[PDB]
XYZ file of C-alpha atoms in Angstrom:
397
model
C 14.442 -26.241 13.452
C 16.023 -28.266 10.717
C 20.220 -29.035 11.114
C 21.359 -32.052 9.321
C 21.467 -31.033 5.241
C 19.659 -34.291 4.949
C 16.349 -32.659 6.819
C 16.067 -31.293 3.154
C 14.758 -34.192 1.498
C 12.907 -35.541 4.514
C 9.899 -35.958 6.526
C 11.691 -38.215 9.439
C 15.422 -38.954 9.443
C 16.287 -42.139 11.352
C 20.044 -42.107 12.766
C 21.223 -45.282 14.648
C 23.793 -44.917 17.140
C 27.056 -46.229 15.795
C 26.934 -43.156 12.854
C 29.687 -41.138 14.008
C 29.582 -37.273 13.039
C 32.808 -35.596 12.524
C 33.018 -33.243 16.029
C 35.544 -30.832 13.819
C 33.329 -30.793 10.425
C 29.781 -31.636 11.455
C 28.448 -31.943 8.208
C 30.878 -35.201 7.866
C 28.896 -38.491 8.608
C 31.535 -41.464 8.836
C 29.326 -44.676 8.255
C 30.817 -48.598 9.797
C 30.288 -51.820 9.018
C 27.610 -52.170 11.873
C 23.902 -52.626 11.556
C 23.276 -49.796 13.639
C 25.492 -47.355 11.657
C 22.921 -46.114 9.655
C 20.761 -43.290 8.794
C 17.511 -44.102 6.958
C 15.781 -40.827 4.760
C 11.845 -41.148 5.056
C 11.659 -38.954 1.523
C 9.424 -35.969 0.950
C 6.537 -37.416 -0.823
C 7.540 -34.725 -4.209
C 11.342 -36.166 -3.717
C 10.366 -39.711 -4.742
C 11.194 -40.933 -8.205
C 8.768 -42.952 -10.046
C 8.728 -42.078 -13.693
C 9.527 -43.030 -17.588
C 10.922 -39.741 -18.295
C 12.174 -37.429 -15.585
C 15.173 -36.172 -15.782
C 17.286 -36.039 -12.313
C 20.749 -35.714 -10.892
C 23.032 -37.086 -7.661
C 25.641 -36.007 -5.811
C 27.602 -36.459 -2.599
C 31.545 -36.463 -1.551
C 32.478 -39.816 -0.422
C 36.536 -40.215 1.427
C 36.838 -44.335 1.009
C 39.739 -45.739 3.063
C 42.310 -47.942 1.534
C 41.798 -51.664 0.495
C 43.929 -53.750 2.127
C 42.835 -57.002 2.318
C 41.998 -59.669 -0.860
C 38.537 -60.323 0.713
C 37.630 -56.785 -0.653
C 38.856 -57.902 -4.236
C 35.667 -58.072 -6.138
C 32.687 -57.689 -3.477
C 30.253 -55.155 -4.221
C 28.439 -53.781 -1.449
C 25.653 -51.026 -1.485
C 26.234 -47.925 0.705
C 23.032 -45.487 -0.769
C 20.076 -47.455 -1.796
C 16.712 -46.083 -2.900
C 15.528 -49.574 -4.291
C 12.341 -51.148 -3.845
C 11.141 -54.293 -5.253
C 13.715 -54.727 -7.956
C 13.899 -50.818 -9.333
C 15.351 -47.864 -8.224
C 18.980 -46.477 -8.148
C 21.651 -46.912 -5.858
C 25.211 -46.052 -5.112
C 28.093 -49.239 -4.317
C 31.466 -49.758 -4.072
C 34.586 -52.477 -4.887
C 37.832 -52.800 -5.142
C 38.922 -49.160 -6.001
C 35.451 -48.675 -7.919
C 32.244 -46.645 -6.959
C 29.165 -47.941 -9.049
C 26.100 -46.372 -9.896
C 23.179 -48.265 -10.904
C 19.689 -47.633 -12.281
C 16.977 -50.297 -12.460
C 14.062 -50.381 -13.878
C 10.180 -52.135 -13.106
C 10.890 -54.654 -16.077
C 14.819 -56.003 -15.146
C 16.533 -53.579 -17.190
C 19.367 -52.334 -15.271
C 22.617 -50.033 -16.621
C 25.746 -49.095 -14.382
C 27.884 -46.105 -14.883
C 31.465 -46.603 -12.934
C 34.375 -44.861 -11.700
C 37.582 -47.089 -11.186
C 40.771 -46.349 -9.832
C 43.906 -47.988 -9.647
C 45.521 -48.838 -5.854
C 49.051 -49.361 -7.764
C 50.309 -45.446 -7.782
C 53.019 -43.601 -6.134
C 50.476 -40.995 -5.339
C 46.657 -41.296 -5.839
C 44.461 -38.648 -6.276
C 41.767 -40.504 -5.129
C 42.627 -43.652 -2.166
C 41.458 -42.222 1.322
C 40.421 -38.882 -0.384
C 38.020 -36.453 -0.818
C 35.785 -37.256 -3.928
C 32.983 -35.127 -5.492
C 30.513 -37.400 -7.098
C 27.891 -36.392 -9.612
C 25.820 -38.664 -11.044
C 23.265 -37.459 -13.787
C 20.194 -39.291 -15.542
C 18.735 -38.381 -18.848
C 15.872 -40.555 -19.770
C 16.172 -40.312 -23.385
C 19.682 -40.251 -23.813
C 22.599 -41.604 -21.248
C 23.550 -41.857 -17.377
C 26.808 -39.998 -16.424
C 29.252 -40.416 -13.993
C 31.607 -37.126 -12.936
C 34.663 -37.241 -10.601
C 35.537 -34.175 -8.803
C 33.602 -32.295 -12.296
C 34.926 -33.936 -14.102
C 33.097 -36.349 -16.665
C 34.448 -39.839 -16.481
C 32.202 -42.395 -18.025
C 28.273 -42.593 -19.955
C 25.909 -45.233 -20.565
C 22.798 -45.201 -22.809
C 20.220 -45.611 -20.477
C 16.710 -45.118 -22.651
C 16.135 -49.098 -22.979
C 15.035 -48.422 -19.176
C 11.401 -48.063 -18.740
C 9.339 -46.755 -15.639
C 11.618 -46.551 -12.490
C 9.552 -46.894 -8.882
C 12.393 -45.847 -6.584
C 12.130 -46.397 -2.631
C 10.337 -43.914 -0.529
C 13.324 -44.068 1.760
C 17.255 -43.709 1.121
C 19.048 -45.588 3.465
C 22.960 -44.909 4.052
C 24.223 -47.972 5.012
C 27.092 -50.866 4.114
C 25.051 -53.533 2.387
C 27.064 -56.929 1.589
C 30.905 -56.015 2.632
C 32.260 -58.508 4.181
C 35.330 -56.768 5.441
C 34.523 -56.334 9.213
C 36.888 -52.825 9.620
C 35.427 -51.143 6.139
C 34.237 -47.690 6.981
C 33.008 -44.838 4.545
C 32.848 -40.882 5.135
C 30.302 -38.960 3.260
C 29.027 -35.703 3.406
C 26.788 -33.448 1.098
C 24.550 -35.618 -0.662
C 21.980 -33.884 -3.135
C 19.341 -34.634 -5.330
C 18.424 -32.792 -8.215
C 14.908 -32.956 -10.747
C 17.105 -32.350 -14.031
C 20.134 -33.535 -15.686
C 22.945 -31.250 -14.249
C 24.976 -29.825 -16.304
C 29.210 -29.601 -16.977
C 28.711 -25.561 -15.446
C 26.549 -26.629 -12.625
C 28.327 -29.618 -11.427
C 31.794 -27.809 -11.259
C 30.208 -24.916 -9.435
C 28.666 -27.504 -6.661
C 32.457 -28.675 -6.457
C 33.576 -25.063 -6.177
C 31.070 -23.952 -3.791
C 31.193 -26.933 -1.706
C 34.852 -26.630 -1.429
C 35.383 -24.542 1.521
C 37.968 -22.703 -0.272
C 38.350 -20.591 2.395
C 39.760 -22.993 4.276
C 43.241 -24.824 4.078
C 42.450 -28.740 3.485
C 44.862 -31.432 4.338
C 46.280 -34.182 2.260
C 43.101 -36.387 2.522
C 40.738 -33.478 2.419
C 39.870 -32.632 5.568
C 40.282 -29.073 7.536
C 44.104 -28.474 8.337
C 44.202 -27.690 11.683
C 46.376 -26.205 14.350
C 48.372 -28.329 16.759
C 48.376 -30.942 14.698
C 51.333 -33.392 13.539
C 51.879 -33.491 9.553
C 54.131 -35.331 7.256
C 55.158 -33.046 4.392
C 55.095 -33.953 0.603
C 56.110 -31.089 -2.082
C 54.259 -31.798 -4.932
C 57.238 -30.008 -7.355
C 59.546 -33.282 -5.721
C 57.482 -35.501 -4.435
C 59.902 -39.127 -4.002
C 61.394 -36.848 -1.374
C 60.964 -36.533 1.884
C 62.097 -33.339 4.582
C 64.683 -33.725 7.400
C 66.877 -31.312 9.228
C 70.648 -31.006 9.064
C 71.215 -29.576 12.610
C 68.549 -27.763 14.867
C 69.786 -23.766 15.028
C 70.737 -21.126 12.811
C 73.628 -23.033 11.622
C 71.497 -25.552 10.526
C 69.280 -25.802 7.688
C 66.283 -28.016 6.496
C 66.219 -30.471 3.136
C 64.988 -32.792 0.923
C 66.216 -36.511 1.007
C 64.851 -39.265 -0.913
C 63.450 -41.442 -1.768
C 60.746 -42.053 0.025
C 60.018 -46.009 0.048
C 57.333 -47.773 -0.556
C 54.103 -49.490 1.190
C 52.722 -52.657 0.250
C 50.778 -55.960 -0.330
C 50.702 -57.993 -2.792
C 48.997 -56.164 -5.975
C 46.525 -55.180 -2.972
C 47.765 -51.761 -2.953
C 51.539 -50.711 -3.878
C 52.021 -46.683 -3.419
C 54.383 -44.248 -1.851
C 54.931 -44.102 1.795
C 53.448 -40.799 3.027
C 54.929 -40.952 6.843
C 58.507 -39.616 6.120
C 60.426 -37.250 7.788
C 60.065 -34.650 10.203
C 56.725 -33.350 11.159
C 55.369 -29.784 11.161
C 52.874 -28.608 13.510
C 50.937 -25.090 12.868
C 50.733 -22.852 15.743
C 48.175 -19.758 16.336
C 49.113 -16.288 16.331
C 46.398 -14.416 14.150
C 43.902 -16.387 13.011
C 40.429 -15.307 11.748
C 38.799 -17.635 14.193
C 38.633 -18.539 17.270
C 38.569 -22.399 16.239
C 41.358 -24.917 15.536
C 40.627 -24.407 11.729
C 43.603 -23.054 9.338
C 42.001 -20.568 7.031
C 43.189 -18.229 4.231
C 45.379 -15.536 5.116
C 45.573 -16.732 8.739
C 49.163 -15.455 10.310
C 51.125 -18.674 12.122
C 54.084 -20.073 13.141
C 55.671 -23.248 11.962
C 56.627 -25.766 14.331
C 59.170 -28.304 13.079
C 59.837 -31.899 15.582
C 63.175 -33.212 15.294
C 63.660 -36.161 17.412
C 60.163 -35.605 19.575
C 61.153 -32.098 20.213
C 59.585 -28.882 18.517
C 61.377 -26.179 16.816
C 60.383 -23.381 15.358
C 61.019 -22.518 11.736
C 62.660 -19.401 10.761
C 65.144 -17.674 8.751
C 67.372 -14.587 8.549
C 65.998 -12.415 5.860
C 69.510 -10.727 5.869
C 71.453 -13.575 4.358
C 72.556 -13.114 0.156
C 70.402 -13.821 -2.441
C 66.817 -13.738 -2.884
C 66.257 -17.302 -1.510
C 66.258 -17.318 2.470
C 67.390 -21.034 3.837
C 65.276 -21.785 6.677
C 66.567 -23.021 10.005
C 65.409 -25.268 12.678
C 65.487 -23.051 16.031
C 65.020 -23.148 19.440
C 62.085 -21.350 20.456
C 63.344 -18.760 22.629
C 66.738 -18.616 20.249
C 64.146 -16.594 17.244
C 64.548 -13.104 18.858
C 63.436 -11.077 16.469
C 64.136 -13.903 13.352
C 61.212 -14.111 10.946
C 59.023 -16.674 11.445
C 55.522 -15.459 10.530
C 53.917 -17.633 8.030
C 50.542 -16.234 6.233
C 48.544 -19.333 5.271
C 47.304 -19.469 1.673
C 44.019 -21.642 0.159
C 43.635 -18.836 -2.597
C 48.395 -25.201 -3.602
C 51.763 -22.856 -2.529
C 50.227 -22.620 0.992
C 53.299 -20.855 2.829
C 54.215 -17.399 2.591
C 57.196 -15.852 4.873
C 56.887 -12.384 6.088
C 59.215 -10.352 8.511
C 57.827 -8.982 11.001
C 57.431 -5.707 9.845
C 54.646 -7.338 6.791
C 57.250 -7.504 4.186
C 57.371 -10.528 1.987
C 59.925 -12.771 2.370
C 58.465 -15.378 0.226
C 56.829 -18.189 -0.549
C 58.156 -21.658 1.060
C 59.525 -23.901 -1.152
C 63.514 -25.394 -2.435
C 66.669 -24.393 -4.130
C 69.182 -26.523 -4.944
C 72.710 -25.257 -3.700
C 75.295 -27.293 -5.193
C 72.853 -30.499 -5.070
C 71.447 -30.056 -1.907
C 67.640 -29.212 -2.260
C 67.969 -26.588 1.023
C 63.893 -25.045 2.096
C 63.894 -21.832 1.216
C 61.581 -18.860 2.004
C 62.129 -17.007 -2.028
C 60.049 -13.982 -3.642
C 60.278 -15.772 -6.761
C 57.880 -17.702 -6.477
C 55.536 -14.759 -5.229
C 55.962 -13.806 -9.073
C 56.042 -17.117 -10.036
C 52.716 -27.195 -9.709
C 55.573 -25.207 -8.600
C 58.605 -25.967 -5.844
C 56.333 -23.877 -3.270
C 53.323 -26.434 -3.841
C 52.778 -28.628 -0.646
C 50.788 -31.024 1.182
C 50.060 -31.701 5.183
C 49.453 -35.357 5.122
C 48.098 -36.563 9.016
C 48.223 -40.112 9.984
C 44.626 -41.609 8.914
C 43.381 -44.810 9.444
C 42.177 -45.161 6.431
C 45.689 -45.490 5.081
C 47.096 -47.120 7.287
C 50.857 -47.135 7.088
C 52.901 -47.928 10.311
C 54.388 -44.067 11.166
């Protein structure tokens, strides 16, 4: 009885002890700079490449922690090879890069890259969830596509016959920074060239879109601290202006910086007060947020939790939400239906009416939270993000 996705390209998988499966997303494989964190494919014999001519196709999501230090500046180290005396292809990474390279049995070898900058507010891409495709027409050019989308080609027909490995082994090869970790999960081979339709419906359908994702990609979760960025405002940062219904909840910028050197200088993600999702209906019995799950919203001001809420009776369409006590809701709204299907809050009373989706108003230049039907109609103000602390980030909270 086959588990692991990779049992579908193998005869014998070979895991070594220090490859750490994520206990919340199983299909998750984090991989360290360790000889024994490994896993080593023993390929199907059909599975092996060794050809002038055939078409074929790669892909995998890869979540690549943040570069810190300058000894990462310009080493490339494998992480997937399938190379065997000089030919074959392989996956590596640098300094905000992931490479892809193809070598034939003569010394011909062409690269396909994706590069991304570390010097952004907000990157789309540092400690993320990526969707790599890689495709390989023999006659014509190697691709490389980024979440589906196409990002760079390379004539690759000067290549001859390519004798790949009989194994794939998942492994860092050559980095010499001691803490440099990788997550993967979902890698695929394919005996064609995929595709612009195929690829993006391997994103979609490997997507989970079910299920709420946090900032870096991973499965929001209940009971679980998260800083908050609005994606409408996103220099600014929420805080509360008194706990209780006198009270109300903001934005305040600006947010600040993290740095070194031109190592890395972005946005500083751990800001203001923390929200942590609490069960009342969910679909499932586990600690996964998914769509249309019904929770509250916890909200910590100074190491205490709160619980977010509003009086649907107040003027005007947009409802400022308060900061309460717990016991002080009474009969308050304060459901919140979770939305995947990236405005991911919607306010209901607790009779099901809508109060709205969560998002901002300014009232006389004070961007207030507000629960507000508008935006039911309606990147917009209700657009956020749950951002955990991550160690591959690495900010001091």
């Amino acid at each position: 009885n086959h588990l692991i996705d990779l049992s579908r390209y193998a005869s014998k998988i070979n895991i070594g002890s220090k490859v750490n499966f994520d206990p919340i997303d199983k299909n998750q494989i984090q991989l360290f700079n360790l000889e024994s964190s490994k896993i080593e494919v023993i390929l199907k014999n059909a599975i092996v490449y060794n050809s002038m001519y055939e078409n074929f196709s790669t892909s995998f999501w890869i979540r690549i922690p943040k570069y810190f230090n300058s000894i990462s500046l310009n080493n490339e180290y494998t992480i997937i090879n399938c190379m065997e005396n000089n030919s074959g292809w392989k996956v590596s990474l640098n300094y905000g890069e992931i490479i892809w390279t193809l070598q034939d049995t003569q010394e011909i070898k062409q690269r396909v890259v994706f590069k991304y900058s570390q010097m952004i507010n907000i990157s789309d891409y540092i400690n993320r969830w990526i969707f790599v495709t890689i495709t390989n027409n023999r006659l014509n050019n190697s691709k490389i596509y980024i979440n589906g989308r196409l990002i760079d080609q390379k004539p690759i027909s000067n290549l001859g016959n390519i004798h790949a490995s009989n194994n794939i082994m998942f492994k860092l090869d050559g980095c010499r920074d001691t803490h440099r970790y990788i997550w993967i999960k979902y890698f695929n081979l394919f005996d064609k060239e995929l595709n612009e339709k195929e690829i993006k419906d391997l994103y979609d359908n490997q997507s989970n879109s079910g299920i709420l994702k946090d900032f870096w990609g991973d499965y929001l979760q209940y009971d679980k601290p998260y800083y908050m960025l609005n994606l409408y405002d996103p220099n600014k940062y929420v805080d509360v202006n008194n706990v209780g219904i006198r009270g109300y909840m903001y934005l305040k910028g600006p947010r600040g910086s993290v740095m070194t050197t031109n190592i890395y200088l972005n946005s500083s993600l751990y800001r203001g007060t923390k929200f942590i999702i609490k069960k009342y209906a969910s679909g499932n019995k586990d600690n996964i947020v998914r769509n249309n799950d019904r929770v509250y919203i916890n909200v910590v001001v100074k190491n205490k939790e709160y619980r977010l809420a509003t009086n649907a009776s107040q003027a005007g369409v947009e409802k400022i939400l308060s900061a309460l006590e717990i016991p002080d809701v009474g009969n308050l709204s304060q459901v919140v239906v979770m939305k995947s299907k990236k405005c991911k809050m919607n306010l209901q009373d607790n009779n099901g009416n809508d109060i709205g989706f969560i998002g901002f108003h300014q009232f006389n230049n004070i961007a207030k939270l507000v629960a507000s039907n508008w935006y039911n109609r309606q990147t917009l103000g209700c657009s956020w993000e749950f951002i955990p602390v991550d160690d591959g980030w690495g900010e001091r909270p």
